[PDB]
Amino acid sequence: ASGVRLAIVASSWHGKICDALLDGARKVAAGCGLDDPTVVRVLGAIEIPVVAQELARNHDAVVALGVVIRGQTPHFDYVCDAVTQGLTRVSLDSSTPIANGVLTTNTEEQALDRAGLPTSAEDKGAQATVAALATALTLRELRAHS
Amino acid sequence: ASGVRLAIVASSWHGKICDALLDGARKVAAGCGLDDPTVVRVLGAIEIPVVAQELARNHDAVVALGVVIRGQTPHFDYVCDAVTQGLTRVSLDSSTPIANGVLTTNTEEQALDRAGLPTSAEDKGAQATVAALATALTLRELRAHS
Amino acid sequence: ASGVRLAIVASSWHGKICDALLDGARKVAAGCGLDDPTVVRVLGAIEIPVVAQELARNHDAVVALGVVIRGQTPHFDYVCDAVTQGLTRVSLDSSTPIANGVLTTNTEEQALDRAGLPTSAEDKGAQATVAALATALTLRELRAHS
Amino acid sequence: ASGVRLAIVASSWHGKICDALLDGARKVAAGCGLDDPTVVRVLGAIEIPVVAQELARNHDAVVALGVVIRGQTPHFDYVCDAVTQGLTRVSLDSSTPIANGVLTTNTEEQALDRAGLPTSAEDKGAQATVAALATALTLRELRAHS
Amino acid sequence: ASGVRLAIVASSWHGKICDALLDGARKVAAGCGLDDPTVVRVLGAIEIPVVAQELARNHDAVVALGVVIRGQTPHFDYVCDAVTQGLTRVSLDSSTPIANGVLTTNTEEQALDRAGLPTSAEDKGAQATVAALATALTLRELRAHS
Ligand SMILES: O=c1[nH]c(=O)c2c([nH]1)n(C[C@@H](O)[C@H](O)[C@H](O)CO)c(=O)n2CCCCC(F)(F)P(=O)(O)O
Ligand SMILES: O=c1[nH]c(=O)c2c([nH]1)n(C[C@@H](O)[C@H](O)[C@H](O)CO)c(=O)n2CCCCC(F)(F)P(=O)(O)O
Ligand SMILES: O=c1[nH]c(=O)c2c([nH]1)n(C[C@@H](O)[C@H](O)[C@H](O)CO)c(=O)n2CCCCC(F)(F)P(=O)(O)O
Ligand SMILES: O=c1[nH]c(=O)c2c([nH]1)n(C[C@@H](O)[C@H](O)[C@H](O)CO)c(=O)n2CCCCC(F)(F)P(=O)(O)O
Ligand SMILES: O=c1[nH]c(=O)c2c([nH]1)n(C[C@@H](O)[C@H](O)[C@H](O)CO)c(=O)n2CCCCC(F)(F)P(=O)(O)O
Ligand SMILES: [K+]
Ligand SMILES: [K+]
Ligand SMILES: [K+]
Ligand SMILES: [K+]
Ligand SMILES: [K+]
Ligand SMILES: [K+]
Ligand SMILES: [K+]
Ligand SMILES: [K+]
Ligand SMILES: [K+]
Ligand SMILES: [K+]
Ligand SMILES: [K+]
Ligand SMILES: [K+]
Ligand SMILES: [K+]
Ligand SMILES: [K+]
Ligand SMILES: [K+]
Ligand SMILES: [K+]
Ligand SMILES: [K+]
């Protein structure tokens, strides 16, 4: 995937988990021959789509990373709705894969188990990056060349 | 339906169930006189809409196939929301039927029962392909000729 | 309403209830002076929006008819979400009333009770056609004439 | 506020409660010295957005009035989804305030208590009309002038 | 951030809490070198998106502030849906961060605890303003300059 132009936008709310997701995404990229993806940090998940929109103008794939954990109020629901609506719109507006590596969990324990920290069962940041690269390559093959 | 240009995009997440959906889809297409539909694989359901969008540009119908099974977190809900929002937008943007053969189940048992395996109650992949082809033929008759 | 150009698109999933809805729609149309509305059948509710979009280009109102009954899986929810998002978009894109006569029930008995059979409490097919025609006539009044 | 061009669109479903909302709306408009608002009736809440779209072309603000009361089926949910999606889209397409005076209650008593009868705790018809007028005035001040 | 043009739109439903969110927003802005953000008041949360849309034409970031507290009817859900859908669209239409500082809580107690009063656990008005400003600065760096 060495010719793929990859961007990663990672939210910061939930610093340690977000750092873990970003590390996983960056390692997949480097594993795939990309040592220099564009990496941008934003404060919360709601800020991701507008930045992803900008990044989609100059990249073949964008990986969105973040962590949303339910609390005591309906806020969780609306944060997640905004992200889903935003990322879906951006991908289709730009005809560019925007992989969703934004964790949406009920508990912190669940988020930790999915961030690819040392004891985690999985890494959604890494998975989201494979998805982004694989889709970019597939689109490259489907589009105009001769 | 021998003149209809059909594309099938299939998510890889639950590989065995996805293989089963694709088999049903392909057999329907072949029975209707189409031995060579455009078949594209993607990694996860979220990746389907952007690829479906590309395929809608030069096909009369697109069949989306995949399997989303609910787990411990709200992830299931947001994957399904993205797929719904995306496929709906793509079909209307492109004025092209995008048939939904993306299983959205609570259990693996339920998904298996709907993948048209020897013992399955039904085959969602075959059903979605019938729907895509029937709708394309209907649109052809509705539109400009002769 | 003899001057209004009416289309009716009806899904075939749950055939007898759909037939019942279509009968109610046709009777209202005839009563309002329209013996020959454009009637198109599709396989499932998900196929309605793209066909409604096509019909909206050539008609003053479209009636969407269908039956979606909840089963074992979350699939009901997303089918209904798709229908709602699609018809809403189509109505506003085309500035054309698209009446929602798509039943969304928990049981078959509920669906029967709203299909306007001899024993039914109401006829949603008839209701949706009144809604479509009334709204078309209202828009005709509000828009440019002399 | 005497120079704002106001339109009101009110659905007819639950006629008495719909009339109460409308009286509250008209009272506010008269109280603010408005030239007779454009008043349009539609059959059900789903018809409101397309008519509000037409009204927004010729008015500084639109008040949407209606009553949706939950029953036995999931249909309440999808009616409200459609209204929410439609009105939000119309407001933004037209850059015009569309005030949401559409009651969404679980019971008839709840709707009555919010419709501005002598014994009502609230008057949501009046409130929506205040919001419409205020927002129109705010926009006028924000936009281009001497 | 002294060169960023900031706008704040604040709903007046729940006056005291709104004032508190606004104070947090203004303090963050002042701390980052902005003493004079554009501040606009609206009556309800549903009015925010149309005003944010106007503000986005003339500003680098917009902070939406407000308070939606659940009551006895589903109406809370649809207000929050409208705000979520609206703000998300406005941000992407305008390619401008629209920060969501609209509290969505089950109780008045919860809203007070998130408004940054003296004994509050957090200040979401302050948080939303940091988000808006950080995202504007990020976008400035990503976009065209020499
Ligand atoms: O990445 C995130 N992850 C998050 O978990 C998050 C974020 N972001 N934001 C806010 C953020 O998305 C925006 O920056 C903010 O709304 C301003 O735009 C949140 O308010 N949250 C908290 C959502 C859950 C609310 C809760 F804290 F659990 P509560 O106890 O208030 O219900
Ligand atoms: O076809 C799928 N089928 C799926 O079941 C799926 C997919 N895809 N993706 C993610 C995938 O769609 C994207 O590739 C990813 O978000 C990157 O964009 C998932 O996270 N899932 C799992 C959703 C359910 C998560 C769960 F495992 F059940 P959990 O226990 O974490 O709640
Ligand atoms: O009119 C309908 N009415 C329907 O009830 C329907 C339809 N259509 N479709 C599918 C259909 O909308 C599309 O043709 C298909 O997805 C291909 O695009 C469905 O899958 N359904 C079934 C939804 C209910 C799910 C269930 F069958 F009960 P389950 O037990 O699998 O949850
Ligand atoms: O203003 C309304 N208020 C309403 O309460 C309403 C409306 N409209 N419509 C239908 C109507 O919006 C459209 O005219 C129709 O779908 C055709 O487009 C409804 O079906 N309803 C009722 C929703 C269904 C609830 C119920 F009838 F009680 P049920 O027991 O069937 O769940
Ligand atoms: O900022 C707000 N905060 C709010 O809490 C609010 C607002 N606004 N609006 C209405 C408002 O958004 C609009 O101005 C109105 O719909 C007209 O467009 C409301 O109806 N509410 C009340 C929502 C909850 C309703 C309830 F009071 F809990 P109920 O008991 O009626 O269900
Ligand atoms: K791109
Ligand atoms: K929790
Ligand atoms: K990691
Ligand atoms: K090619
Ligand atoms: K096509
Ligand atoms: K499960
Ligand atoms: K099969
Ligand atoms: K038309
Ligand atoms: K059932
Ligand atoms: K009937
Ligand atoms: K006129
Ligand atoms: K206007
Ligand atoms: K009830
Ligand atoms: K701007
Ligand atoms: K409460
Ligand atoms: K404060
Ligand atoms: K740059």
Closest by Cα among E130, E128, E126 to E24: E126
The contacts found for B53-57 with CB under 8 angstroms, 24 or more apart, are B53/A92, B53/A95, B53/B90, B53/B93, B53/B94, B54/A95, B54/A139, B54/A142, B54/A143, B55/A142, B55/B7, B55/B9, B56/B7, B56/B90, B56/B91, B56/B93, B56/B94, B56/B96, B56/B98, B57/B94
E45 lines ligand 5 (CB under 6 A): yes
Residue C137 exposure: Cα atoms within 13 Å on the Cβ side: 13
Question: D109 in contact with C at a CB cutoff of 8 Å?
Answer: no
**The dihedral sign for the CA sequence B123, B129, B132, B137:** negative
Closest by Cα among D45, D47, D44, D48 to D8: D48
With a Cβ cut-off of 6 Å, ligand 1 is lined by A 11, 13-14, 43-47, 66-73, 75-76, 79; E 99-101, 128, 131
B101 within 8 A of B28, measured Cβ to Cβ? no
Q: What is the resolution of this structure in A?
A: 1.9
Question: E100 in contact with A at a CB cutoff of 8 Å?
Answer: yes
3-state secondary structure chain D: CCCCCEEEEEECCCHHHHHHHHHHHHHHHHHCCCCCCEEEEECCHHHHHHHHHHHHCCCCEEEEEEEEECCCCCHHHHHHHHHHHHHHHHHHHHCCCEEEEEEEECCHHHHHCCECCCCCCCEHHHHHHHHHHHHHHHHHHHCCCC
Alpha-carbon distance D19 to D22, whole Å?
5
Nearest C-alpha in E relative to D62: E47
- Burial track D86-95 (b if 16+ CB lie within 10 A, e otherwise): bbbbbbbebe
What is the third-level CATH fold of C1-146? Rossmann fold (3.40.50)
Q: Which atom of ligand 2 is nearest to the CA of A131?
A: 14
Closest protein CA for atom 8 of ligand 3: C44
What token pair was written down for B146? 């002769």
**The dihedral sign for the CA sequence A126, A131, A137, A139:** negative
**The dihedral sign for the CA sequence C43, B142, B92, B135:** positive
Chain B neighbours, 3+ Cβ pairs < 8 A: A, C
Alpha-carbon distance E48 to E25, whole Å?
16
Question: Is position E47 annotated in a ligand binding site?
Answer: yes
Block residue for tokens 């920290």: A117
Closest protein CA for atom 23 of ligand 2: B76
Question: Across the interface, do D106 and E73 touch by the CB < 8 Å criterion?
Answer: yes
Question: Is position B47 annotated in a ligand binding site?
Answer: yes
D11 within 8 A of D43, measured Cβ to Cβ? yes
Question: E93 in contact with D at a CB cutoff of 8 Å?
Answer: yes
What is the Å distance from ligand 17's center to D57 Cα?
A: 5
Q: For ligand 13, an ion, list residues with CB under 5 A.
A: C 96
D110 within 8 A of E73, measured Cβ to Cβ? yes
Alpha-carbon distance A21 to D86, whole Å?
37
Nearest C-alpha in D relative to C87: D82
What token pair was written down for B32? 């209707």
A114 within 8 A of A101, measured Cβ to Cβ? no
C-beta neighbour count of E113 within 10 angstroms: 19
Block residue for tokens 């999808």: D78
Question: Across the interface, do C82 and B95 touch by the CB < 8 Å criterion?
Answer: no
What are the backbone angles phi and psi of residue E8, rounded to the nearest 5°? -130, 125
Cis peptide before B146 (omega within 30 of 0): yes
Question: Is position B57 annotated in a ligand binding site?
Answer: no
Question: Across the interface, do C49 and B97 touch by the CB < 8 Å criterion?
Answer: no
Alpha-carbon distance D36 to B105, whole Å?
54
Which one of A18, A70, A75 would you pick to mutate in the ligand 1 pocket, going by the greatest count of ligand atoms within 8 A of its CB? A75
B40 within 8 A of A135, measured Cβ to Cβ? no
C-beta neighbour count of A26 within 10 angstroms: 22
To the nearest whole Å, the CA of B126 is away from the closest chain A CA by: 24
Question: B27 in contact with A at a CB cutoff of 8 Å?
Answer: no
H-run or E-run covering C8: strand C6-11
D135 within 8 A of D97, measured Cβ to Cβ? yes
C126 within 8 A of C63, measured Cβ to Cβ? no
Closest by Cα among D91, C4, D24 to E85: D91
Q: How was this structure determined?
A: X-ray
Closest by Cα among B81, C85, B91, A91 to E92: A91
Q: Which atom of ligand 1 is nearest to the CA of A12?
A: 1
